[PDB]
Amino acid sequence: TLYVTVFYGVPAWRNATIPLFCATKNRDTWGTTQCLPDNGDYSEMALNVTESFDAWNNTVTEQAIEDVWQLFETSIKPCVKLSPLCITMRCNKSETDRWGLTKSITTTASTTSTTASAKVDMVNETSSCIAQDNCTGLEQEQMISCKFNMTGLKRDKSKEYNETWYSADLVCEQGNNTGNESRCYMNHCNTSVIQESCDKHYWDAIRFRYCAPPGYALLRCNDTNYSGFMPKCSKVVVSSCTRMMETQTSTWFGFNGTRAENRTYIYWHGRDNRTIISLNKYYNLTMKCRRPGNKTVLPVTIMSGLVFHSQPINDRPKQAWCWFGGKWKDAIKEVKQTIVKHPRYTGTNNTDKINLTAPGGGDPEVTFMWTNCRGEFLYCKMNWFLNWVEDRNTANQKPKEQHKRNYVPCHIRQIINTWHKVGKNVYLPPREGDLTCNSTVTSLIANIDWIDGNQTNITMSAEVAELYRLELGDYKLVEITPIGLAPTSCKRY
Amino acid sequence: LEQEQMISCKFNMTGLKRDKSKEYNETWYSADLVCEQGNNTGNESRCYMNHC
Amino acid sequence: GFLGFLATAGSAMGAASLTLTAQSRTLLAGIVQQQQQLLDVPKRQQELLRLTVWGTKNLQTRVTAIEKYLKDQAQLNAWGCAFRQVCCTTVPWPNASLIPKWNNETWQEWERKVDFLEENITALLEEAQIQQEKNMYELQKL
Amino acid sequence: GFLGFLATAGSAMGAASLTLTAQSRTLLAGIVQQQQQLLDVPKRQQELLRLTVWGTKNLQTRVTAIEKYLKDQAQLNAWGCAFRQVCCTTVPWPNASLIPKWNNETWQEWERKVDFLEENITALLEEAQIQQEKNMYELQKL
Amino acid sequence: GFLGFLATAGSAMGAASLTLTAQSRTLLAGIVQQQQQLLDVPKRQQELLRLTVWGTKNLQTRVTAIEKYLKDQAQLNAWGCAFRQVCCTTVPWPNASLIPKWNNETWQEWERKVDFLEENITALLEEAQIQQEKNMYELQKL
Numbered sequence: 009t010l011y012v013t014v015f016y017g018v019p020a021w022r023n024a025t026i027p028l029f030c031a032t033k034n035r036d037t038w039g040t041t042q043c044l045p046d047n048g049d050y051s052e053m054a055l056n057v058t059e060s061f062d063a064w065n066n067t068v069t070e071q072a073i074e075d076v077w078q079l080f081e082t083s084i085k086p087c088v089k090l091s092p093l094c095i096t097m098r099c100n101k102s103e104t105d106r107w108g109l110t111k112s113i114t115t116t117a118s119t120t121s122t123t124a125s126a127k128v129d130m131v132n133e134t135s136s137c138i139a140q141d142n143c144t145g146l147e148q149e150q151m152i153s154c155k156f157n158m159t160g161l162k163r164d165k166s167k168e169y170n171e172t173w174y175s176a177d178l179v180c181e182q183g184n185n186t187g188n189e190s191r192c193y194m195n196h197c198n199t200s201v202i203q204e205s206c207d208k209h210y211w212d213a214i215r216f217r218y219c220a221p222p223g224y225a226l227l228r229c230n231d232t233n234y235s236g237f238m239p240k241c242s243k244v245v246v247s248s249c250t251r252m253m254e255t256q257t258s259t260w261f262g263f264n265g266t267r268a269e270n271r272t273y274i275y276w277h278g279r280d281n282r283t284i285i286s287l288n289k290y291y292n293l294t295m296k297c298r299r300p301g302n303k304t305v306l307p308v309t310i311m312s313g314l315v316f317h318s319q320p321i322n323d324r325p326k327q328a329w330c331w332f333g334g335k336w337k338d339a340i341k342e343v344k345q346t347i348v349k350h351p352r353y354t355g356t357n358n359t360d361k362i363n364l365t366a367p368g369g370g371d372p373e374v375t376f377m378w379t380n381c382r383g384e385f386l387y388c389k390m391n392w393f394l395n396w397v398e399d400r401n402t403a404n405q406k407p408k409e410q411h412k413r414n415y416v417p418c419h420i421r422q423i424i425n426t427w428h429k430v431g432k433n434v435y436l437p438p439r440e441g442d443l444t445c446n447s448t449v450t451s452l453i454a455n456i457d458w459i460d461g462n463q464t465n466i467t468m469s470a471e472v473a474e475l476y477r478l479e480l481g482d483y484k485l486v487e488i489t490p491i492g493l494a495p496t497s498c499k500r501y
Numbered sequence: 502l503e504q505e506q507m508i509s510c511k512f513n514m515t516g517l518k519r520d521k522s523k524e525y526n527e528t529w530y531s532a533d534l535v536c537e538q539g540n541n542t543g544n545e546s547r548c549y550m551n552h553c
Numbered sequence: 554g555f556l557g558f559l560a561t562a563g564s565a566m567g568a569a570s571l572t573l574t575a576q577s578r579t580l581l582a583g584i585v586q587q588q589q590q591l592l593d594v595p596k597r598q599q600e601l602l603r604l605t606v607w608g609t610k611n612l613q614t615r616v617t618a619i620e621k622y623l624k625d626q627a628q629l630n631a632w633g634c635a636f637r638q639v640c641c642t643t644v645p646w647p648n649a650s651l652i653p654k655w656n657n658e659t660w661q662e663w664e665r666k667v668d669f670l671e672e673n674i675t676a677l678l679e680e681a682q683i684q685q686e687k688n689m690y691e692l693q694k695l
Numbered sequence: 696g697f698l699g700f701l702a703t704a705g706s707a708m709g710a711a712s713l714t715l716t717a718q719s720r721t722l723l724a725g726i727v728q729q730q731q732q733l734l735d736v737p738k739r740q741q742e743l744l745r746l747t748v749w750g751t752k753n754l755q756t757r758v759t760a761i762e763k764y765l766k767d768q769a770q771l772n773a774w775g776c777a778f779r780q781v782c783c784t785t786v787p788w789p790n791a792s793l794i795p796k797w798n799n800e801t802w803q804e805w806e807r808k809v810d811f812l813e814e815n816i817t818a819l820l821e822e823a824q825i826q827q828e829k830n831m832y833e834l835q836k837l
Numbered sequence: 838g839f840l841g842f843l844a845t846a847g848s849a850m851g852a853a854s855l856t857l858t859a860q861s862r863t864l865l866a867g868i869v870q871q872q873q874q875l876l877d878v879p880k881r882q883q884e885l886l887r888l889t890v891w892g893t894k895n896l897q898t899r900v901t902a903i904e905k906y907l908k909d910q911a912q913l914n915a916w917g918c919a920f921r922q923v924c925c926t927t928v929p930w931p932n933a934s935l936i937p938k939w940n941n942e943t944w945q946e947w948e949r950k951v952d953f954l955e956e957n958i959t960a961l962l963e964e965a966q967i968q969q970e971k972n973m974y975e976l977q978k979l
């Protein structure tokens with residue numbers, strides 16, 4: 009009686025695992041070469057369907073992470089290799105001893121001072137201490153002047169050059185230098201070859217959106233209860249392309265997020281306690297970073313004919329530093345409250361027993377905060393900041409860490425181990441002139457870890473990749489498979 | 502059955518530090534070397550790889 | 554694009570507007586956007602068109618757009634439908650235990666309950682067409 | 696092909712001269728010559744087949760010919776009239792202000808005057824085909 | 838790997854098969870297996886996808902197969918027998934001197950005896966279709 013019949017144009021789908029197209033507005037380099045132009049269509053329609061969503065186990069977020077990484081690699085790939093520079097350099101001894109790269113026992117320093125010296129120092133836009141880069145506690149940058157012998161395309165002739173390195177970028181040979189001119193090499197050369205990131209990478213913003221190929225569609229949760237993992241999402245919105253994503257990579261805090269809303273959200277990985285806490289834009293949280301001093305950049309042509317950008321500064325500038333503005337104290341109170349009320353949390357409901365904290369260990373990739381300020385990476389020690397925002401009773405943190413300030417000291421590092429799971433080292437060319445960056449702060453990257461109903465530790469994390477799961481995350485990609493079967497009485501002829 | 506015929510040769514090779522180098526112990530199969538001939542009345546004959 | 558396939562979702566099995574023509578137009582949209590971008594890339598990069606990962610990803614989606622289109626037309630032809638709105642068959646439904654509620658269940662819910670049969674049905678539909686071709690051949694000989 | 700298809704251009708719209716076979720023969724002639732070259736190249740160059748600019752270009756021209764064929768056949772199937780000349784669709788002409796002079800205007804001139812109608816018409820023609828076919832389903836059930 | 842055509846190769850011209858759906862089945866099996874591997878390669882190797890020659894050989898192979906599929910469909914559309922088995926064209930057989938033994942010869946044996954007729958026949962079949970087409974145009978116009 010009932011025949012299978014096959015219906016075509018059927019409104020049904022299944023999970024897809026395919027590549028998405030990138031589309032952009034910035035077509036100066038990578039956009040023209042790799043991406044579709046942004047179609048400009050940001051409309052969406054809702055369906056009366058229920059669907060399962062999961063930010064961590066997603067193909068949409070997985071591609072965002074991998075694609076940002078690959079566009080970085082294809083940009084640096086053809087740049088000059090700096091293995092010709094892995095030679096002994098002749099560095100000023102006072103500087104290598106002073107900042108700890110080399111050792112000396114002839115300094116015989118002895119200091120007596122007051123220990124009851126903690127201060128509270130606030131800064132804002134209307135202040136001369138910012139304009140002059142001189143706030144209480146800010147020391148010098150720690151740049152070391154080194155000379156070296158380099159050969160260009162003439163081969164049988166060579167010249168001596170002036171390079172001033174950040175102390176973070178050198179190793180320096182130690183022991184029995186009873187004169188001057190210490191012997192130094194780059195921090196990560198010998199186990200590998202350092203490549204220069206010459207094609208203006210990170211000097212501007214990279215923003216793009218993803219588009220489904222024909223026959224595929226993106227579904228999105230449009231709830232307020234989406235916490236990263238949601239088995240039954242009742243508000244499912246359909247679109248052909250995602251929202252525009254900011255491919256920014258910083259640890260501890262994320263900056264310039266697209267998911268900026270007048271609400272605090274916390275995505276929790278369903279199987280773990282790693283979370284991405286958005287911040288409430290209501291408080292206009294912002295970070296203003298400054299790199300004082302006027303740099304000179306000197307191109308050097310080396311053997312292969314490719315150019316390296318040297319840094320002959322010959323000066324002693326103040327440290328790079330970052331200034332935090334906006335209502336930070338209140339934004340943090342909301343984060344703690346949001347955690348307390350969150351469905352996956354069964355810890356303390358006392359907000360005075362919930363604290364922000366740095367990860368431990370001596371590893372700079374987790375103990376600092378890395379901000380890319382227009383091409384230069386700026387690691388910042390944040391104890392002054394944390395003590396302030398928490399209104400912490402410092403008391404026993406040792407004399408230079410006991411202060412409450414809304415700014416932190418930071419140092420520039422030119423040889424940066426990259427963020428993806430590669431371990432690769434690249435060199436970041438210097439920027440000419442000075443640098444200033446004014447970014448919004450949109451998210452906090454942290455784990456929530458408690459073992460009792462007192463002390464919850466929101467532990468700052470350095471997994472930069474987690475940020476992409478806040479930018480997207482709520483998207484699912486599906487395949488439209490519009491062939492259906494259904495028993496009916498209508499046998500052919 | 503006889504011995505394999507392996508020849509022990511030393512050479513100076515440079516790694517990534519460029520201005521630093523080390524001497525290495527390399528034992529070649531005899532068929533992999535050319536070896537310069539004539540008036541070696543001492544030791545340390547002078548050899549190159551067979552196909553370079 | 555248009556996504557009329559999703560626009561009618563949730564309307565139940567006794568569905569309206571099964572937009573058959575939607576597949577032809579989704580193919581056209583695919584071809585136009587990819588072709589325009591490939592013509593655009595050479596303005597700055599003429600060599601590394603497929604020789605850099607972005608172009609292997611974009612070629613794969615272009616070739617695939619052609620192949621997906623053809624898989625559906627070929628499957629439909631394999632089942633006897635030059636054009637398929639419903640294109641009725643001669644193959645009976647596997648059992649009475651799996652009957653849709655035309656006025657309650659949706660196509661998404663329904664299809665996910667019969668994936669099992671789709672694997673066995675595809676073969677049966679093809680077998681029915683093979684016998685029909687044999688019957689036509691005998692009529693041609695007669 | 697010989698491109699004799701356009702030989703009639705300048706004859707006026709109503710001067711017959713329409714054909715459904717010209718594109719098949721143009722494509723078929725093309726496929727044979729292009730396949731012969733794909734198989735000829737390896738007699739001298741086996742590694743660099745698409746590793747060069749000319750390799751990529753030959754890919755692009757073979758694919759373009761195929762995509763074009765499919766775009767047109769797919770659109771006709773959506774309207775259903777793959778083999779029907781005039782096709783006889785049931786969609787009314789949009790307005791009386793746009794009427795051809797069958798014995799004055801040519802098809803080149805005419806089509807460039809109705810490019811904006813195609814934008815609304817394609818969808819109407821597709822729906823008409825869907826409505827006709829769903830009615831046939833109801834009739835087969837009855 | 839259906840092998841439906843080869844299966845009746847040893848019988849006789851006036852005996853068996855004349856199968857159309859087997860080409861669709863063959864194409865579907867091919868496309869699905871290639872897609873499964875293309876989705877699989879990026880699981881381990883994303884950079885070397887078209888960059889090196891193995892990927893250009895697999896690409897040429899796939900493109901050739903697609904062109905072949907469409908080549909036969911295009912020729913049939915010109916003749917009209919997309920789905921007509923024997924088609925029934927009106928072009929006279931070139932001469933009475935070359936006649937099949939329907940009960941002794943196979944199609945393989947037969948086709949190799951008419952290779953020098955096909956060169957003229959394809960063109961003649963197309964010309965016949967063109968005149969019939971013109972006649973149908975005028976009848977539809979009337």
Ligand SMILES: *[C@@H]1O[C@H](CO)[C@@H](O[C@@H]2O[C@H](CO)[C@@H](O[C@@H]3O[C@H](CO[C@H]4O[C@H](CO[C@H]5O[C@H](CO)[C@@H](O)[C@H](O)[C@@H]5O)[C@@H](O)[C@H](O[C@H]5O[C@H](CO)[C@@H](O)[C@H](O)[C@@H]5O[C@H]5O[C@H](CO)[C@@H](O)[C@H](O)[C@@H]5O)[C@@H]4O)[C@@H](O)[C@H](O[C@H]4O[C@H](CO)[C@@H](O)[C@H](O)[C@@H]4O)[C@@H]3O)[C@H](O)[C@H]2NC(C)=O)[C@H](O)[C@H]1NC(C)=O
Nearest residue numbers: 022023060061062065066237238239240277278279280484
């Ligand atoms: C399209 O995409 C979407 C989005 O990704 C897909 O949705 C996701 O699909 C997944 C695959 O099916 C689901 O995961 C699976 O869930 C199973 C059920 O988990 C619950 O029950 C567990 C045990 O309970 C048994 O007994 C009860 C009796 O009432 C039965 O009802 C159950 O069915 C079981 O028989 C229980 O342990 C689970 O709890 C743990 O996991 C959840 C995960 O969400 C956590 O939230 C919990 O906190 C808890 O985590 C702890 O324990 C796990 C180990 O189990 C650790 O890894 C964690 O770190 C932590 O310590 C739930 O209550 C699981 O049984 C199943 O696991 C089996 O199979 C996998 C292989 O797939 C093996 O590797 C495992 O070892 C095990 O054998 C798996 O986790 C997702 O939940 C679902 N996501 C959403 C949002 O809905 C969709 O399927 C896709 N569709 C298509 C067509 O592709």
Ligand SMILES: *[C@@H]1O[C@H](CO)[C@@H](O[C@@H]2O[C@H](CO)[C@@H](O[C@@H]3O[C@H](CO[C@H]4O[C@H](CO)[C@@H](O)[C@H](O)[C@@H]4O)[C@@H](O)[C@H](O[C@H]4O[C@H](CO)[C@@H](O)[C@H](O)[C@@H]4O[C@H]4O[C@H](CO)[C@@H](O)[C@H](O)[C@@H]4O[C@H]4O[C@H](CO)[C@@H](O)[C@H](O)[C@@H]4O)[C@@H]3O)[C@H](O)[C@H]2NC(C)=O)[C@H](O)[C@H]1NC(C)=O
Nearest residue numbers: 208211212213263264380382439440441444445446447448
């Ligand atoms: C978070 O988000 C915020 C935004 O909300 C980010 O902050 C913004 O970031 C922008 C992108 O970096 C930055 O814009 C740049 O400012 C530079 C300073 O210009 C100032 O004056 C102009 C007016 O003339 C103002 O419009 C501008 O706002 C500033 O006040 C400009 O120099 C930059 O312009 C450059 O790019 C355009 C691109 O079209 C070029 O046409 C132009 O010639 C400039 O080109 C230089 O930089 C490009 C980078 O692509 C190079 O390719 C190019 O060769 C030039 O570089 C050379 O010249 C410099 C010296 O000029 C030299 O050092 C170098 O070595 C080269 O020789 C551009 O307009 C916003 O100002 C900034 N806004 C604020 C308020 O902070 C923030 O970064 C994000 N934060 C994080 C964490 O990422």
Ligand SMILES: *[C@@H]1O[C@H](CO)[C@@H](O[C@@H]2O[C@H](CO)[C@@H](O[C@@H]3O[C@H](CO[C@H]4O[C@H](CO)[C@@H](O)[C@H](O)[C@@H]4O)[C@@H](O)[C@H](O)[C@@H]3O)[C@H](O)[C@H]2NC(C)=O)[C@H](O)[C@H]1NC(C)=O
Nearest residue numbers: 269270271272287288289290291292335337338339341342
């Ligand atoms: C955007 O986000 C803003 C927050 O970042 C939203 O502002 C909040 O809006 C709520 C709802 O109106 C206010 O809650 C009320 O507060 C008053 C005042 O209580 C004060 O004193 C008690 C002690 O007695 C103390 O516990 C409170 O914290 C306050 O200090 C209460 O009387 C009400 O019952 C209620 O709790 C928030 O106070 C207010 N926050 C801030 C920082 O202003 C804003 O509404 C959002 N915008 C939009 C458009 O939605």
Ligand SMILES: *[C@@H]1O[C@H](CO)[C@@H](O[C@@H]2O[C@H](CO)[C@@H](O[C@@H]3O[C@H](CO)[C@@H](O)[C@H](O)[C@@H]3O)[C@H](O)[C@H]2NC(C)=O)[C@H](O)[C@H]1NC(C)=O
Nearest residue numbers: 277278279280281282352353354355456457458459460461
């Ligand atoms: C995130 O950290 C919290 C705190 O450690 C984890 O909570 C813990 O959850 C597990 C179950 O997932 C609890 O273990 C079970 O407890 C019950 C009740 O005592 C017991 O009957 C079971 O035999 C088992 O021991 C554990 O006690 C609980 N700890 C606390 C202090 O709440 C949470 O699961 C972590 N999230 C993930 C996914 O790791």
Ligand SMILES: *[C@@H]1O[C@H](CO[C@@H]2O[C@@H](C)[C@@H](O)[C@@H](O)[C@@H]2O)[C@@H](O[C@@H]2O[C@H](CO)[C@@H](O)[C@H](O)[C@H]2NC(C)=O)[C@H](O)[C@H]1NC(C)=O
Nearest residue numbers: 179180181182183191192193195196197198199200517518
């Ligand atoms: C690459 O160099 C590092 C460091 O260089 C050496 O140690 C410095 C302190 C200085 O004295 C340089 O002149 C030396 O060349 C090597 O790491 C050291 O390895 C030793 C032995 O395991 C260990 O005792 C030291 O603590 C390590 N020091 C540091 C700073 O890590 C590293 O092994 C070299 N890699 C290669 C391939 O040569």
Ligand SMILES: *[C@@H]1O[C@H](CO[C@@H]2O[C@@H](C)[C@@H](O)[C@@H](O)[C@@H]2O)[C@@H](O[C@@H]2O[C@H](CO)[C@@H](O)[C@H](O)[C@H]2NC(C)=O)[C@H](O)[C@H]1NC(C)=O
Nearest residue numbers: 348349353354355356357358359360361459460461462463
């Ligand atoms: C927090 O919740 C407690 C009740 O739950 C207890 O504390 C949790 C942190 C957790 O460890 C649970 O397992 C415990 O059972 C509230 O305590 C009650 O407060 C009322 C007054 O409002 C008092 O009359 C009850 O007797 C208290 N109950 C108990 C068991 O002591 C506490 O007030 C909540 N605090 C906040 C800030 O919300």
Ligand SMILES: *[C@@H]1O[C@H](CO[C@@H]2O[C@@H](C)[C@@H](O)[C@@H](O)[C@@H]2O)[C@@H](O[C@@H]2O[C@H](CO)[C@@H](O)[C@H](O)[C@H]2NC(C)=O)[C@H](O)[C@H]1NC(C)=O
Nearest residue numbers: 533534535536537538539540546547548549550551552553
């Ligand atoms: C590469 O080297 C071979 C051999 O090296 C030379 O001869 C050896 C016996 C020894 O004395 C080495 O130090 C020498 O450098 C060259 O082959 C010889 O060519 C000459 C001239 O045609 C011929 O008379 C010899 O018999 C050849 N000897 C052997 C062992 O083949 C070869 O020509 C060199 N190739 C190049 C490009 O220089």
Ligand SMILES: *[C@@H]1O[C@H](CO)[C@@H](O[C@@H]2O[C@H](CO)[C@@H](O)[C@H](O)[C@H]2NC(C)=O)[C@H](O)[C@H]1NC(C)=O
Nearest residue numbers: 132133135136137138139140296443444445446
């Ligand atoms: C980021 O914000 C700072 C203010 O904190 C801006 O610096 C001021 O710029 C104006 C215009 O050139 C000067 O008149 C002020 O004197 C500057 N202030 C200070 C403290 O120096 C800065 O221009 C903003 N953005 C960027 C990219 O530089």
Ligand SMILES: *[C@@H]1O[C@H](CO)[C@@H](O)[C@H](O)[C@H]1NC(C)=O
Nearest residue numbers: 052053054230231244245246
């Ligand atoms: C998503 O939710 C907002 C309210 O937060 C609503 O205004 C909007 O229309 C919803 N989008 C869709 C497609 O329904």
Ligand SMILES: *[C@@H]1O[C@H](CO)[C@@H](O)[C@H](O)[C@H]1NC(C)=O
Nearest residue numbers: 156157158165166167168169
């Ligand atoms: C460096 O080069 C200069 C010539 O430009 C030469 O006089 C000097 O001796 C060289 N120094 C070293 C250590 O090679």
Ligand SMILES: *[C@@H]1O[C@H](CO)[C@@H](O)[C@H](O)[C@H]1NC(C)=O
Nearest residue numbers: 111180181182183184185186
């Ligand atoms: C320094 O000299 C002393 C002898 O006075 C010797 O024992 C020591 O090993 C030397 N150290 C280095 C690094 O050369």
Ligand SMILES: *[C@@H]1O[C@H](CO)[C@@H](O)[C@H](O)[C@H]1NC(C)=O
Nearest residue numbers: 100101185186187188189190
């Ligand atoms: C410092 O360098 C100079 C050469 O520029 C050298 O003459 C002097 O002796 C060095 N100082 C010491 C303590 O050796």
Ligand SMILES: *[C@@H]1O[C@H](CO)[C@@H](O)[C@H](O)[C@H]1NC(C)=O
Nearest residue numbers: 510511512523524525526527
């Ligand atoms: C080679 O090995 C011998 C031991 O047989 C050792 O004495 C010599 O120093 C080694 N030479 C090199 C270059 O490693």
Ligand SMILES: *[C@@H]1O[C@H](CO)[C@@H](O)[C@H](O)[C@H]1NC(C)=O
Nearest residue numbers: 536537538539540541542547
């Ligand atoms: C070996 O020495 C003799 C002189 O005794 C000389 O004629 C001959 O050229 C030399 N051969 C070599 C290879 O040096």
Ligand SMILES: *[C@@H]1O[C@H](CO)[C@@H](O)[C@H](O)[C@H]1NC(C)=O
Nearest residue numbers: 511540541542543544545546
């Ligand atoms: C062997 O080499 C040594 C140097 O290591 C040298 O002194 C000695 O004389 C050489 N043997 C002969 C036979 O020349």
Ligand SMILES: *[C@@H]1O[C@H](CO)[C@@H](O)[C@H](O)[C@H]1NC(C)=O
Nearest residue numbers: 055056057561562563564565
């Ligand atoms: C979807 O929900 C709206 C109300 O928001 C209702 O009017 C509409 O009929 C529903 N559609 C379906 C297919 O359930």
